[PDB]
Structure 1
Amino acid sequence: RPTFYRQELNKTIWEVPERYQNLSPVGSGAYGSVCAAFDTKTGLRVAVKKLSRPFQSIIHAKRTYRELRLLKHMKHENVIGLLDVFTPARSLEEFNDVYLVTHLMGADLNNIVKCQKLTDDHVQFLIYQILRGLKYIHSADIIHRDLKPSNLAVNEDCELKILDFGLARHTRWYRAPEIMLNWMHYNQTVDIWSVGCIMAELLTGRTLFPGTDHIDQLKLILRLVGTPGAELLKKISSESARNYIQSLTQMPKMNFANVFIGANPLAVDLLEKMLVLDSDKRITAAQALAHAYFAQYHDPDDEPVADPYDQSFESRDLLIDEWKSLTYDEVISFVPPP
């Protein structure tokens, strides 16, 4: 065991091992109860997240178990990984707190683009890294579901890591329409749509689709990608959806080259491949990585897939204490990095 140390930041109290000094409440709890700290053992700066009421209900206990499992699985340069997970409980019996530790990233895209648009080479390198991380997560059947600029962490290096993946469900500005509009089905390409919206924002400096709500959002998307065609409506299982869609004013798809003027045309062609309404036609992360727009960074031999990930628990309906014990088991068997 290690020697812990109490303290109270904001209003919450924190009990971490002594190897973690200088805890300072980071990014307005936007990433949750996270503190920046110094790793006395690695001499590196890490981010410390104390889960909020980890086992108050079944649902919380399940989300806690889900989080730990996901973080323990992530072993990739472009996806946040687990440096350490600890609890101040000497027993499963008194296990009520969870703390997760990852590398500390400098900033997130929600702010850096808020300093005016980016250069094309900056977009190539950032979007490239997102696609590499996405290729890895999707290869394990994990979907981020809420890819957003504040969910993309970068260092001064422009080194990029995806965060907060696979938590959402089982903001709308970046959401794929097959999620907005009722639920005409979907897949992992729901993340590609988000990357499309993000890339667009980075290139222009403006929110591609600044929706006011679900209906205003959809309306903004169709204006750009156009009204759903016959091949698309043929695949819509939702009678509800087929009504709305087939009833609103028919809009043609616009010329991206005209909407994104002066942008690297290679970039425009890629945006065309990501921003398609039909989720079966959207480009994949793996395919996108081979897009000429990334000629300068692409390397098939260094774009790894992930080991398989056991998501069967997702289907289980257990008691709070059973999720707790499972979480406890996961904390216990944790094996740090190299």
Structure 2
Amino acid sequence: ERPTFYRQELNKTIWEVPERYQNLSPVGSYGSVCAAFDTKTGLRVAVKKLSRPFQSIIHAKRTYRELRLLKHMKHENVIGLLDVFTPARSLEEFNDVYLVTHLMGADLNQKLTDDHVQFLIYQILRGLKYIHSADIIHRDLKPSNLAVNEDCELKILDATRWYRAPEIMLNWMHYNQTVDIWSVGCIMAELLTGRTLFPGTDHIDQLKLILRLVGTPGAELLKKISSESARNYIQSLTQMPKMNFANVFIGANPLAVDLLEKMLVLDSDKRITAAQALAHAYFAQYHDPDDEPVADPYDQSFESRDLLIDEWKSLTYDEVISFVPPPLD
């Protein structure tokens, strides 16, 4: 049987949650999140109430997508689902979705020491290895999507353009997983210097700042570009030379500089992968081949489906029903 719920009004919204969760306190406003005490585990959790989860086809599918993704993620450097619930007793009543996860400290968004940079980028790459092994691309990696507790343990959660790979800016539709490695490079650079590596004011400025560091594309990359207008734009630009990173990141650990060179390669095909970066010398004190696990296969065949609102809603409901809490250990 389902547990006993209780209503209350927090900020704007009504909140109907199981008695299990106590002392709800707002932490910000996709949906709004409350901090809470979980009486079953004795841990602090974050409860997210999705807003209007089924108000349109796209909302409906987004709701399903988010629930599917969170139910899949089981890795210490990625956000996972402690609980999901609805106060509804039937599919017909069903209109609210709440998700529960570990309350984490602040987000990553100062100049940090080299050992702090090592450990944090290590953990990001370890989560990303896992995510990527599932054929999931994060696409929106940035400091505010990284939660860090006082113990410097990090979990991947969820201007965006500052961390975006140049092939996304240029609107290539066949970009792949290494768009995330680009973002890691921009994050790591920012941690090491205390400044945004590429703080473009728009998408055009963004590219200009990028190419000025990494150089304008050579013939070899230009020959893989299918869009004539895209090729025209970059081919019409002032041909910047690739900068010496050891000069640009003056004083940083030479191994950090070398990893940055391998992450921030213009050509997506020659960018280091998550698994490869983990074996890089910069992470010598943290890397362990037997504790960098891959994920179970993830079925995202639903991404290609076009369904009705009630159908996405019903798929989401099934997923709420089949949820198995993770082991209390």
Q: TM-score range by the shorter chain?
A: over 0.9
Measure how far apart 1:147 and its partner are.
0.1
Aligned partner of residue 88 in structure 1, secondary structure: coil
Contact 1:184–1:236 (CA<8 Å) still a contact in 2?
no
Listed as ranges, the matches of 1:56-71 within 5 Å are 56-71=55-70
**Structure 2 equivalent of residue 302 of structure 1:** 291
CA separation in 2, counterparts of 1:305 and 1:184?
26
CA separation in 2, counterparts of 1:225 and 1:136?
28
CA separation in 2, counterparts of 1:254 and 1:195?
19
Contact 1:7–1:13 (CA<8 Å) still a contact in 2?
yes
What do residues 219-271 of structure 1 show as CA deviations (whole Å, max 9, x unaligned)?
A: 00000001000110000011110000000100000011111111001000000
What do residues 70-114 of structure 1 show as CA deviations (whole Å, max 9, x unaligned)?
A: 000000000000000000101100100000001110110018xxx
CA separation in 1, counterparts of 2:31 and 2:128?
23
TM value normalised by structure 2: 0.97
Which 5+ residue runs of structure 2 have no aligned equivalent?
Answer: none
Residue correspondences, number: 325
CA separation in 2, counterparts of 1:93 and 1:12?
22
Measure how far apart 1:10 and its partner are.
1.2
CA separation in 1, counterparts of 2:13 and 2:292?
41
What do residues 2-49 of structure 1 show as CA deviations (whole Å, max 9, x unaligned)?
A: 000111111111111111011111145xx8411111101100001100
Following TM superposition, where does structure 1 have runs of at least 4 consecutive aligned residues deviating by more than 6 angstroms? none
**Structure 2 equivalent of residue 5 of structure 1:** 6
Aligned partner of residue 193 in structure 1, secondary structure: helix
**Structure 1 equivalent of residue 74 of structure 2:** 75
**Structure 2 equivalent of residue 231 of structure 1:** 220
Greater shift, 10-19 or 288-297, is seen at: 10-19
Measure how far apart 1:183 and its partner are.
1.5
Measure how far apart 1:186 and its partner are.
1.3
- Are 2:115 and 1:121 aligned? yes
What do residues 135-159 of structure 1 show as CA deviations (whole Å, max 9, x unaligned)?
A: 0000000000000100000110100
Aligned partner of residue 33 in structure 1, secondary structure: strand
Contact 1:178–1:185 (CA<8 Å) still a contact in 2?
no
What do residues 295-335 of structure 1 show as CA deviations (whole Å, max 9, x unaligned)?
A: 00000000000000010111110000000010000000100
Aligned partner of residue 14 in structure 1, secondary structure: strand
Contact 1:79–1:133 (CA<8 Å) still a contact in 2?
yes
Over aligned residues, Cα RMSD in angstroms? Answer: 1.0
Measure how far apart 1:181 and its partner are.
1.3
Measure how far apart 1:203 and its partner are.
0.3
- Are 2:47 and 1:48 aligned? yes
CA separation in 2, counterparts of 1:298 and 1:211?
34
What do residues 100-130 of structure 1 show as CA deviations (whole Å, max 9, x unaligned)?
A: 001110110018xxxxx10100000000000
Contact 1:184–1:237 (CA<8 Å) still a contact in 2?
no
Cα pair distance change 1:27/1:262, threshold 3 Å: farther
Aligned partner of residue 328 in structure 1, secondary structure: helix
CA separation in 1, counterparts of 2:91 and 2:47?
22
Measure how far apart 1:182 and its partner are.
2.6
Which 5+ residue runs of structure 1 have no aligned equivalent?
Answer: 112-116, 165-170
CA separation in 2, counterparts of 1:185 and 1:325?
31
Greater shift, 293-302 or 175-184, is seen at: 175-184
Aligned partner of residue 199 in structure 1, secondary structure: helix
CA separation in 1, counterparts of 2:198 and 2:137?
22
What do residues 37-70 of structure 1 show as CA deviations (whole Å, max 9, x unaligned)?
A: 1101100001100011100001000000000000
Cα pair distance change 1:27/1:257, threshold 3 Å: farther
CA separation in 1, counterparts of 2:77 and 2:50?
23
Measure how far apart 1:201 and its partner are.
0.3
CA separation in 2, counterparts of 1:318 and 1:258?
53
Aligned partner of residue 280 in structure 1, secondary structure: helix
Q: Identity of counterpart residues, as a percentage? A: 100
Contact 1:184–1:241 (CA<8 Å) still a contact in 2?
no
CA separation in 2, counterparts of 1:287 and 1:151?
23
CA separation in 2, counterparts of 1:59 and 1:156?
37
CA separation in 2, counterparts of 1:190 and 1:269?
19
Cα pair distance change 1:220/1:74, threshold 3 Å: same
Contact 1:89–1:96 (CA<8 Å) still a contact in 2?
yes
Aligned partner of residue 94 in structure 1, secondary structure: coil
TM value normalised by structure 1: 0.95
Measure how far apart 1:185 and its partner are.
3.5
Greater shift, 205-214 or 7-16, is seen at: 7-16
**Structure 2 equivalent of residue 216 of structure 1:** 205
Cα pair distance change 1:132/1:266, threshold 3 Å: same
Aligned partner of residue 110 in structure 1, secondary structure: coil
Greater shift, 190-199 or 178-187, is seen at: 178-187
CA separation in 2, counterparts of 1:80 and 1:96?
24
Contact 1:184–1:238 (CA<8 Å) still a contact in 2?
no
